[PDB]
Tab-separated table of N, CA and C in Angstrom:
chain	number	residue	atom	x	y	z
A	1	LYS	N	-13.362	-54.188	77.425
A	1	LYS	CA	-13.561	-53.709	78.964
A	1	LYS	C	-14.799	-54.687	78.963
A	2	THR	N	-15.765	-54.700	79.884
A	2	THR	CA	-16.656	-55.778	80.312
A	2	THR	C	-17.855	-55.072	80.267
A	3	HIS	N	-17.401	-53.445	80.734
A	3	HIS	CA	-18.678	-52.268	80.872
A	3	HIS	C	-17.932	-51.163	80.155
A	4	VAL	N	-19.099	-50.212	79.499
A	4	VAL	CA	-18.587	-48.988	78.807
A	4	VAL	C	-19.474	-48.089	79.172
A	5	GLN	N	-19.166	-47.012	79.807
A	5	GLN	CA	-19.696	-45.658	79.649
A	5	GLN	C	-20.681	-44.912	78.803
A	6	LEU	N	-21.791	-45.160	78.815
A	6	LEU	CA	-22.450	-44.262	77.644
A	6	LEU	C	-23.296	-43.167	78.014
A	7	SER	N	-23.365	-42.197	77.075
A	7	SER	CA	-24.919	-41.123	77.872
A	7	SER	C	-25.648	-41.140	76.589
A	8	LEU	N	-26.907	-41.736	76.774
A	8	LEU	CA	-28.005	-41.831	75.713
A	8	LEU	C	-28.780	-41.215	75.554
A	9	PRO	N	-29.207	-40.422	74.317
A	9	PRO	CA	-30.457	-38.907	74.144
A	9	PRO	C	-31.397	-39.621	74.459
A	10	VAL	N	-32.092	-38.869	75.195
A	10	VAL	CA	-33.549	-39.432	75.246
A	10	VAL	C	-34.460	-38.804	74.560
A	11	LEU	N	-35.075	-39.697	73.617
A	11	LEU	CA	-36.085	-39.356	72.568
A	11	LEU	C	-37.365	-39.646	72.875
A	12	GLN	N	-38.288	-38.181	72.818
A	12	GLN	CA	-39.521	-38.254	72.905
A	12	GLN	C	-40.321	-39.256	72.003
A	13	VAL	N	-41.296	-40.155	71.972
A	13	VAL	CA	-41.705	-41.597	70.897
A	13	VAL	C	-42.245	-40.597	69.710
A	14	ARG	N	-42.821	-39.779	69.961
A	14	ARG	CA	-43.559	-39.137	68.557
A	14	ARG	C	-42.349	-38.668	67.648
A	15	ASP	N	-41.299	-38.465	67.947
A	15	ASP	CA	-40.064	-38.202	67.372
A	15	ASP	C	-39.373	-39.073	66.544
A	16	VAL	N	-39.495	-40.277	66.876
A	16	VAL	CA	-38.708	-41.303	66.469
A	16	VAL	C	-39.041	-41.921	65.115
A	17	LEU	N	-37.737	-42.040	64.303
A	17	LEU	CA	-38.319	-42.272	63.012
A	17	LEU	C	-38.103	-43.404	62.610
A	18	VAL	N	-37.333	-44.285	63.505
A	18	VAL	CA	-36.900	-45.553	62.995
A	18	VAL	C	-37.331	-46.519	64.284
A	19	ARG	N	-38.633	-47.036	64.268
A	19	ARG	CA	-39.156	-47.589	65.398
A	19	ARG	C	-38.808	-48.836	66.156
A	20	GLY	N	-37.792	-49.430	65.676
A	20	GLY	CA	-36.974	-50.493	65.916
A	20	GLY	C	-35.846	-50.650	65.465
A	21	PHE	N	-35.386	-52.138	66.336
A	21	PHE	CA	-33.598	-52.628	65.539
A	21	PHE	C	-34.055	-53.780	64.520
A	22	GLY	N	-35.189	-54.275	64.403
A	22	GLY	CA	-35.306	-55.461	63.287
A	22	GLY	C	-36.307	-56.458	64.035
A	23	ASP	N	-35.981	-57.478	63.337
A	23	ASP	CA	-37.491	-58.817	62.763
A	23	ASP	C	-37.394	-59.469	63.769
A	24	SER	N	-36.190	-59.720	64.535
A	24	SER	CA	-36.531	-61.336	65.573
A	24	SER	C	-35.427	-60.754	66.811
A	25	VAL	N	-35.752	-61.424	67.776
A	25	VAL	CA	-35.092	-61.181	69.103
A	25	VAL	C	-33.682	-61.361	68.748
A	26	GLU	N	-32.910	-62.291	68.433
A	26	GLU	CA	-31.599	-62.220	68.274
A	26	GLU	C	-31.146	-60.881	67.598
A	27	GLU	N	-31.858	-60.727	66.379
A	27	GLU	CA	-31.291	-59.258	65.465
A	27	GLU	C	-31.442	-58.147	66.233
A	28	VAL	N	-32.621	-58.073	67.266
A	28	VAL	CA	-32.835	-56.357	67.817
A	28	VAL	C	-31.807	-56.649	68.872
A	29	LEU	N	-31.561	-57.519	69.354
A	29	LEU	CA	-30.147	-57.638	70.708
A	29	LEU	C	-29.154	-57.131	69.738
A	30	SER	N	-28.897	-57.802	68.643
A	30	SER	CA	-27.256	-57.445	67.942
A	30	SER	C	-27.448	-56.083	67.656
A	31	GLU	N	-28.617	-55.505	66.976
A	31	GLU	CA	-28.303	-54.408	66.335
A	31	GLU	C	-28.201	-53.108	67.489
A	32	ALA	N	-28.775	-53.006	68.715
A	32	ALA	CA	-28.688	-52.728	69.704
A	32	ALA	C	-27.439	-52.360	70.117
A	33	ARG	N	-27.062	-53.419	70.085
A	33	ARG	CA	-25.482	-53.675	70.712
A	33	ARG	C	-24.874	-52.799	69.600
A	34	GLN	N	-24.454	-53.203	68.351
A	34	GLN	CA	-24.016	-52.376	67.563
A	34	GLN	C	-24.049	-50.824	67.597
A	35	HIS	N	-25.391	-50.229	67.610
A	35	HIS	CA	-25.740	-48.881	67.539
A	35	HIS	C	-24.879	-48.246	68.778
A	36	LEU	N	-25.203	-48.960	70.062
A	36	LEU	CA	-24.521	-48.686	71.508
A	36	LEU	C	-23.064	-48.301	71.425
A	37	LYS	N	-22.599	-49.517	70.679
A	37	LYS	CA	-20.974	-49.140	70.568
A	37	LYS	C	-21.298	-47.985	69.492
A	38	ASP	N	-21.631	-47.806	68.054
A	38	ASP	CA	-21.432	-46.886	67.374
A	38	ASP	C	-21.961	-45.142	67.794
A	39	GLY	N	-22.549	-45.516	68.742
A	39	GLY	CA	-23.112	-44.024	69.350
A	39	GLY	C	-24.387	-43.498	68.671
A	40	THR	N	-25.043	-44.626	67.784
A	40	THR	CA	-26.346	-44.156	67.412
A	40	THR	C	-27.642	-44.817	67.615
A	41	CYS	N	-27.733	-44.996	69.115
A	41	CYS	CA	-28.737	-45.832	69.711
A	41	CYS	C	-29.448	-44.402	70.742
A	42	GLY	N	-30.622	-44.355	70.888
A	42	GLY	CA	-31.772	-43.701	71.446
A	42	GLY	C	-32.220	-44.072	72.530
A	43	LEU	N	-32.894	-43.696	73.523
A	43	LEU	CA	-33.464	-44.250	74.755
A	43	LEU	C	-34.643	-43.516	74.852
A	44	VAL	N	-36.062	-44.186	74.523
A	44	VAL	CA	-37.252	-43.665	75.234
A	44	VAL	C	-38.007	-43.735	76.294
A	45	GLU	N	-38.225	-43.622	77.187
A	45	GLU	CA	-39.285	-43.591	78.586
A	45	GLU	C	-39.931	-44.231	78.579
A	46	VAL	N	-40.304	-45.212	79.021
A	46	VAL	CA	-41.606	-46.138	79.089
A	46	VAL	C	-42.694	-45.389	79.526
A	47	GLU	N	-43.858	-44.941	78.907
A	47	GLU	CA	-44.796	-45.016	79.915
A	47	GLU	C	-46.253	-45.015	79.023
A	48	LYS	N	-47.425	-45.165	79.692
A	48	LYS	CA	-48.765	-45.741	78.991
A	48	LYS	C	-48.780	-45.065	77.468
A	49	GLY	N	-48.838	-45.713	76.738
A	49	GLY	CA	-49.120	-45.688	75.362
A	49	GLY	C	-48.139	-45.731	74.715
A	50	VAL	N	-46.525	-45.597	75.313
A	50	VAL	CA	-45.332	-45.482	74.181
A	50	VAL	C	-45.229	-46.898	73.446
A	51	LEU	N	-45.286	-48.013	74.025
A	51	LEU	CA	-44.946	-49.349	73.693
A	51	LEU	C	-45.521	-49.583	72.232
A	52	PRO	N	-47.208	-49.499	72.366
A	52	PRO	CA	-47.947	-49.627	71.197
A	52	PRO	C	-47.303	-48.753	69.948
A	53	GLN	N	-46.734	-47.950	70.075
A	53	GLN	CA	-45.939	-46.743	69.048
A	53	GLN	C	-44.745	-47.098	68.483
A	54	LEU	N	-44.667	-48.194	69.147
A	54	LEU	CA	-42.939	-48.998	69.002
A	54	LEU	C	-42.934	-49.913	68.009
A	55	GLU	N	-42.192	-50.415	67.939
A	55	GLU	CA	-42.152	-51.700	66.891
A	55	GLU	C	-41.315	-52.948	67.608
A	56	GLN	N	-42.033	-54.024	67.571
A	56	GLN	CA	-41.811	-55.269	68.644
A	56	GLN	C	-40.503	-56.280	67.388
A	57	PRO	N	-39.623	-56.797	67.673
A	57	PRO	CA	-39.268	-57.017	69.219
A	57	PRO	C	-38.779	-55.588	69.977
A	58	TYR	N	-38.763	-55.528	71.224
A	58	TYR	CA	-38.364	-54.245	71.764
A	58	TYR	C	-37.447	-54.549	72.350
A	59	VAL	N	-36.223	-53.706	72.599
A	59	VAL	CA	-34.746	-53.676	73.518
A	59	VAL	C	-35.193	-53.161	74.626
A	60	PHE	N	-35.486	-53.623	75.772
A	60	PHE	CA	-35.102	-53.014	77.128
A	60	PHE	C	-33.569	-52.476	77.392
A	61	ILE	N	-33.395	-51.845	78.494
A	61	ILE	CA	-32.297	-51.566	79.249
A	61	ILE	C	-32.544	-51.682	80.469
A	62	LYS	N	-32.339	-52.290	81.103
A	62	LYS	CA	-32.663	-52.384	82.603
A	62	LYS	C	-31.924	-52.572	83.534
A	63	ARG	N	-31.710	-51.621	85.176
A	63	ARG	CA	-30.881	-51.956	85.702
A	63	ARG	C	-30.369	-53.393	86.257
A	64	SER	N	-29.055	-53.579	86.501
A	64	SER	CA	-28.536	-54.659	86.436
A	64	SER	C	-27.912	-54.564	88.183
A	65	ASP	N	-28.382	-53.579	88.759
A	65	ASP	CA	-27.522	-53.446	90.214
A	65	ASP	C	-27.707	-51.704	91.169
A	66	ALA	N	-27.228	-52.394	92.037
A	66	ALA	CA	-28.122	-50.443	92.857
A	66	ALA	C	-26.324	-50.113	93.572
A	67	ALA	N	-23.830	-47.064	91.000
A	67	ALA	CA	-24.170	-46.164	90.403
A	67	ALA	C	-22.534	-45.596	89.882
A	68	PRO	N	-21.634	-46.504	89.584
A	68	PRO	CA	-20.483	-45.891	89.099
A	68	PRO	C	-20.119	-44.254	88.424
A	69	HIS	N	-19.677	-43.166	88.920
A	69	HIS	CA	-19.514	-42.118	88.310
A	69	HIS	C	-20.748	-41.102	87.937
A	70	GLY	N	-21.959	-41.907	88.279
A	70	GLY	CA	-23.497	-41.372	87.726
A	70	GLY	C	-24.019	-41.903	86.848
A	71	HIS	N	-23.255	-43.182	86.292
A	71	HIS	CA	-23.749	-44.113	85.245
A	71	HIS	C	-24.146	-45.208	85.942
A	72	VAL	N	-25.327	-45.365	85.630
A	72	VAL	CA	-26.525	-46.717	86.216
A	72	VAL	C	-26.070	-47.867	85.161
A	73	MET	N	-25.411	-49.124	85.739
A	73	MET	CA	-25.521	-50.382	85.299
A	73	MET	C	-26.541	-50.903	84.731
A	74	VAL	N	-26.473	-50.987	83.884
A	74	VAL	CA	-27.497	-51.766	83.161
A	74	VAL	C	-27.290	-53.133	82.106
A	75	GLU	N	-28.366	-53.395	81.622
A	75	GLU	CA	-28.184	-54.881	80.350
A	75	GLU	C	-29.304	-54.888	79.745
A	76	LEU	N	-29.334	-55.457	78.575
A	76	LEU	CA	-30.113	-55.447	77.395
A	76	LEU	C	-31.047	-56.615	77.927
A	77	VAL	N	-32.234	-56.617	77.781
A	77	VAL	CA	-33.669	-57.367	77.755
A	77	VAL	C	-34.285	-57.407	76.449
A	78	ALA	N	-34.625	-58.294	75.745
A	78	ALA	CA	-35.536	-58.142	74.439
A	78	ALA	C	-36.778	-58.677	74.711
A	79	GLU	N	-38.020	-58.574	74.186
A	79	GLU	CA	-39.516	-59.111	74.257
A	79	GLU	C	-40.181	-58.874	73.203
A	80	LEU	N	-40.656	-60.113	72.694
A	80	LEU	CA	-41.373	-60.178	71.936
A	80	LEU	C	-43.049	-61.029	71.778
A	81	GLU	N	-43.860	-60.396	71.895
A	81	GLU	CA	-45.214	-61.233	72.048
A	81	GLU	C	-45.248	-61.303	73.476
A	82	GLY	N	-44.983	-60.763	74.401
A	82	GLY	CA	-45.206	-61.066	75.893
A	82	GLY	C	-43.956	-61.889	76.491
A	83	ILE	N	-42.908	-62.235	75.644
A	83	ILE	CA	-41.971	-63.257	75.993
A	83	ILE	C	-40.435	-62.378	76.299
A	84	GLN	N	-39.570	-62.519	77.381
A	84	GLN	CA	-38.386	-61.851	77.438
A	84	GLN	C	-37.554	-62.622	77.310
A	85	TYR	N	-36.411	-62.564	76.946
A	85	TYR	CA	-35.047	-62.904	76.782
A	85	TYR	C	-33.647	-62.199	77.313
A	86	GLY	N	-33.799	-62.840	78.581
A	86	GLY	CA	-33.095	-62.124	79.589
A	86	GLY	C	-33.763	-61.973	81.089
A	87	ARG	N	-32.928	-61.623	81.706
A	87	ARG	CA	-33.666	-61.603	83.400
A	87	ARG	C	-33.296	-60.403	83.837
A	88	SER	N	-33.438	-59.344	84.409
A	88	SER	CA	-32.846	-58.163	84.934
A	88	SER	C	-34.050	-57.287	85.684
A	89	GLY	N	-33.358	-55.878	86.334
A	89	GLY	CA	-34.136	-55.172	86.976
A	89	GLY	C	-35.009	-54.479	86.226
A	90	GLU	N	-35.236	-52.936	87.133
A	90	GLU	CA	-35.951	-51.933	86.646
A	90	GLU	C	-35.773	-51.626	85.082
A	91	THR	N	-36.386	-51.425	84.269
A	91	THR	CA	-36.827	-50.885	82.885
A	91	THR	C	-36.431	-49.362	83.269
A	92	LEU	N	-35.414	-48.669	82.414
A	92	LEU	CA	-34.794	-47.252	82.562
A	92	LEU	C	-35.121	-46.761	80.925
A	93	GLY	N	-35.635	-48.091	79.928
A	93	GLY	CA	-36.447	-47.368	78.788
A	93	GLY	C	-36.296	-48.614	78.145
A	94	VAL	N	-36.600	-48.483	76.481
A	94	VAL	CA	-36.624	-49.018	75.114
A	94	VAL	C	-35.889	-48.260	74.317
A	95	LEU	N	-34.821	-49.016	73.735
A	95	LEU	CA	-33.614	-48.332	72.555
A	95	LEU	C	-34.242	-48.297	71.328
A	96	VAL	N	-33.967	-47.419	70.747
A	96	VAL	CA	-34.256	-47.456	69.364
A	96	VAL	C	-33.153	-46.633	68.956
A	97	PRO	N	-33.268	-46.706	67.237
A	97	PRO	CA	-32.054	-46.135	66.425
A	97	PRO	C	-32.287	-44.842	66.882
A	98	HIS	N	-31.036	-44.138	66.753
A	98	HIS	CA	-30.887	-42.502	66.751
A	98	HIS	C	-30.347	-42.097	65.280
A	99	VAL	N	-31.361	-41.309	64.574
A	99	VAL	CA	-30.867	-40.722	63.452
A	99	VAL	C	-31.142	-39.445	63.441
A	100	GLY	N	-30.752	-38.681	64.752
A	100	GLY	CA	-30.460	-37.362	64.395
A	100	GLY	C	-31.863	-36.226	65.183
A	101	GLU	N	-32.813	-37.299	65.813
A	101	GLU	CA	-33.804	-36.727	66.751
A	101	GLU	C	-33.178	-35.595	67.795
A	102	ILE	N	-34.220	-34.918	68.122
A	102	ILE	CA	-33.582	-33.839	69.196
A	102	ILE	C	-33.594	-34.495	70.240
A	103	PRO	N	-32.932	-34.869	71.243
A	103	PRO	CA	-33.447	-35.526	72.673
A	103	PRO	C	-33.868	-34.092	73.569
A	104	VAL	N	-34.369	-34.816	74.786
A	104	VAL	CA	-35.168	-33.807	75.586
A	104	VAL	C	-33.869	-34.197	76.804
A	105	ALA	N	-33.290	-34.957	77.007
A	105	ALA	CA	-32.585	-35.345	78.652
A	105	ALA	C	-31.637	-36.491	77.625
A	106	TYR	N	-30.028	-36.651	78.518
A	106	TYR	CA	-29.276	-37.836	78.223
A	106	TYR	C	-29.495	-38.631	79.701
A	107	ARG	N	-29.355	-39.758	79.690
A	107	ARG	CA	-29.424	-40.999	80.012
A	107	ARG	C	-27.876	-41.527	80.874
A	108	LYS	N	-27.498	-41.796	81.340
A	108	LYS	CA	-25.805	-41.810	81.442
A	108	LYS	C	-26.113	-43.601	82.237
A	109	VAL	N	-25.483	-44.521	81.488
A	109	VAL	CA	-25.573	-45.527	81.976
A	109	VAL	C	-24.077	-46.282	81.551
A	110	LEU	N	-24.017	-47.381	82.249
A	110	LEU	CA	-22.919	-48.255	82.294
A	110	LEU	C	-23.165	-49.591	81.748
A	111	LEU	N	-22.807	-49.781	80.242
A	111	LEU	CA	-23.527	-50.808	79.778
A	111	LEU	C	-22.837	-52.245	79.911
A	112	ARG	N	-23.492	-53.380	80.300
A	112	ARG	CA	-22.364	-54.555	80.226
A	112	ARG	C	-22.675	-54.826	78.996
A	113	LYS	N	-21.142	-54.986	78.484
A	113	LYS	CA	-21.090	-55.229	76.805
A	113	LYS	C	-20.136	-56.342	76.822
């Protein structure tokens, strides 16, 4: 399927144990996609002071369309030293590995895979 319905656990930035997916734009997009497939991917909502507490490169989910079955259609955009790889809509949050942190909420997304 070109899209997969996912429910992403929303994590508080200060709880996050593994603060990024790796060391290159290509690696973080790769790793983010693998963790999304394996159900081991969390979401941190972006506000003032969040991104400097996480590791670059960043992987964002961005709204790709204006929402089947409650699931917002999203795609992945990476960012490194202020350059983005991908072009999409509004940021829903920054993806991180999920290693058992307790979430505050779930974000239903339809991921372009």
